[PDB]
Design a protein around this ligand. Sequence first.
Ligand SMILES: Nc1nc2c(ncn2[C@@H]2O[C@H](COP(=O)(O)OP(=O)(O)OP(=O)(O)O)[C@@H](O)[C@H]2O)c(=O)[nH]1
Ligand SMILES: [Mg+2]
Lengths: 160, 51, 102, 167, 56, 249, 142
Amino acid sequence: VSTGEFDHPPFQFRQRHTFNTTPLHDANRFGGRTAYLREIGPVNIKKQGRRFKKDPRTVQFNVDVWCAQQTLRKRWKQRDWEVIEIPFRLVPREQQRVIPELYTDIPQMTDPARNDFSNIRNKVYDREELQGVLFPAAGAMLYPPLQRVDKQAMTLDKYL
Amino acid sequence: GVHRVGYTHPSTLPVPCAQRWDLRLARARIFQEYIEEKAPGAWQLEDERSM
Amino acid sequence: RYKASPHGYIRHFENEVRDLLQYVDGVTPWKQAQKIRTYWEVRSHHPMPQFNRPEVAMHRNTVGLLPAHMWETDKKTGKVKSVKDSVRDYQTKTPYPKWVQL
Amino acid sequence: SETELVAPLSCWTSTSESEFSPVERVHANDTLVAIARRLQCSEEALRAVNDGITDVSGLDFVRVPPEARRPRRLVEPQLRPQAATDALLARTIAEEETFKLKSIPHLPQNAERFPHEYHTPTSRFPPTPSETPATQDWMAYTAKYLDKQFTISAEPAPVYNVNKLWP
Amino acid sequence: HRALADSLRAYVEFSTSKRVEPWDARFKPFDRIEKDGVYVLMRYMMEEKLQLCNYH
Amino acid sequence: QHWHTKRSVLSSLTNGRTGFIVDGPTGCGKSALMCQVVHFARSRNIVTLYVPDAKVWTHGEWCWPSTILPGFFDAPDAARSFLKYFAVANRATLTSWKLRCTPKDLPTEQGERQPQNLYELCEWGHRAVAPASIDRQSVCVKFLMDELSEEKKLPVVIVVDGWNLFSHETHFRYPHPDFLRGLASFNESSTDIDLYPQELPRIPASRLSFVRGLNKMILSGDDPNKFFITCTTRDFKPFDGISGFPNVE
Amino acid sequence: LKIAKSAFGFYLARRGQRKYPFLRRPHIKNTHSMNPSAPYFWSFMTAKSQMAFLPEENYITGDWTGKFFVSKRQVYTLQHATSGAKVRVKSFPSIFEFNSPSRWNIGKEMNTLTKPRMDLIDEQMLTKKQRLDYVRAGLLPK
Ligand SMILES: Nc1nc2c(ncn2[C@@H]2O[C@H](COP(=O)(O)OP(=O)(O)OP(=O)(O)O)[C@@H](O)[C@H]2O)c(=O)[nH]1
Ligand SMILES: [Mg+2]
């Protein structure tokens, strides 16, 4: 549901900088990438040009690679986590099952019987709850345990 | 980040377990699979348009 | 004559590949295959075989790359007027790469 | 004058001795009981070859009894023996000796100096930068470059494998 | 041949020689007075490198 | 306002934590609620830090290594503007404040005065010609926070809008180590800094000298003098699983 | 076609100035093949990798009587210069010879050493009308 532009504008009569119109390879499109596509100047057709830069299919392919990079980039900035490979024994009760690979079965609910329905795929675990498991060697806990909020405590929002 | 990919042999863990890369080599023997050594880790790009 | 024959993609042809290799190797004297050159071995005798294109390393070009002794310059402009002849005085211990004996 | 001959691959005979690994690796958690169960041995037989050892904690490798039911094979069986592939190449291997070919250089002498010039057609973008010693996390970096009396040399490293590119 | 020789000479002479500053000073963080901000960051940490690459 | 009397009441109202963090969706009352708290606090004449937008620190113009704290960092522009407005907002109370620990030797230009107040100190921080302002502000922020943590009787209200920016990494990354080692040619140093860009680990906000000061007050007990009424910001760009390029108009 | 410069003048239609899909024009006429670049010298209209072997056409493949011209994708090799043997290429009107050998040629394909469209024009291969049209464009003097 993005508002951004995913399509390169079609070649036509030369666009110029106007109210309501900008040049085709103007620096403001695709975050200035259009540099890669630009033949500057009053191009002399017969003698000069770089053919791929006016070609619709080629140009659009390039733009599509750039969009893909944008999405990839933002999906990785979106991660706060690493995948760690933990032996079956030591893992929390919810993962003790079989977990079909991606796009293999129906998107899968973590624990329907305990009232948790969410993708097991996207469930993220706290480095602090897995401490005993991930750093057994260390003796004394490296990360201090999470402090949690009493939801039965009388605090400012309960009006007391 | 620029890092060294790393592998922990199961004999060295404080519980033996089957490492995903090892499994990957199994899968490569079974369906004979070219493992591209120079495949850049940074270049995962799904094809947005069709996917 | 009645064989199971692989089809389509080249992977499926494992047997055939081995045979094609065996055959090729058997038929093809090293004496002859010596003589096939790679572009860089050939270009090694061009007077300026190595420099950086502008995309990545351009600023790493050195003035030491230029074969200035090969040409003739104008003092005022700083421009190349003529080029000396390359071939007559050209000495090399390596017309072919060092490992090629014909 | 030349000293020996090597038999063609079809003439080779395999022995249990050459085929199965004599020795076994020891896991961190290992007991003699565990190892024996893994190799199907009786525990006493495992002791016998290993000199009545009791605790295995100080050992990389334990010697395996011939009595063992499940051994490891020394090398993957479905692998092709090198004698076969070299039988494919026989003429070439004789020519290698005739012409006294030690090496055929793939790249020109100075090639690493020009990064964008020699791109083999197996090479892929984006290029990877050479590694750097302390870079993997802020604590390591800080310890090595910024503040050098910093006590924690790296941020706690989970003993299990962390897959940084994933999937 | 001489057109080529000469243009190689020119190309390398350009790669080797210095250039004008690449950044547009009309915007930020570059407009800032040369004694502060990015320019401080440049004078003390990046200067040597910026000169090695000749402001290409 | 008078906490020392009400200590039990207060501590039960936050349940032992040091103040609150207000959270919600984008665009509900959060930043506004913080404004109001600053109004209530300052009208009642309490000493108040107000960071109106946290992004001026963690996502900044630029980032200097701090001068006297090894291994930490500054946002020099954020810091300077802060030292300025903090001083002029609290000037009444801050002029009564005497310095329990700051060196009495501070470097000073001819015709200028050694600070005897917290106000005087903050003044000393931001009034200088650049570049001097830059190192002065580092020293000054370190000592300011060291002074704040040492005051146990005078209520102090710290309002930070967008705390959630202070609790993770800033958008600055540690300089590539080859900026630190000096160089002859790019030709062969075995260096890539000019060839390829690369990401180095982000600098965590907790390594900003300012945020260090605050965290020091939160985490150490034996500071029940201080109240953090703090806020969250969800102002982030939208991302739904594909992104095109934003139309700049 | 209007004028028949070859047999195909009879068989082919021009279809005005008609557009073909990208990089497929029926007839490969490489006007650009000699198009000077100092910085791109080794990447332009040459092999995409310097580890590629020279083409078929640098080698004598079979039992030959001899050839008239060598192909134009043949690459100029130090021996082309040194050996002092005939090196011909088929260009128009007839054939171009490399007579004056230089090392500056080495490592490029003869495509690149032979100017396809010469600044030189024969007035005798031109109709009086065509000569007029070449004077309009400011090529021929008159
Ligand atoms: N007068 C008044 N105006 C409010 C109040 N809450 C919201 N507004 C108005 O509505 C806007 C809501 O914007 P913010 O309060 O900045 O939204 P926010 O919760 O800080 O959301 P993010 O910063 O985007 O995480 C404000 O700019 C105010 O103009 C309120 O409690 N009193
Ligand atoms: Mg807000």
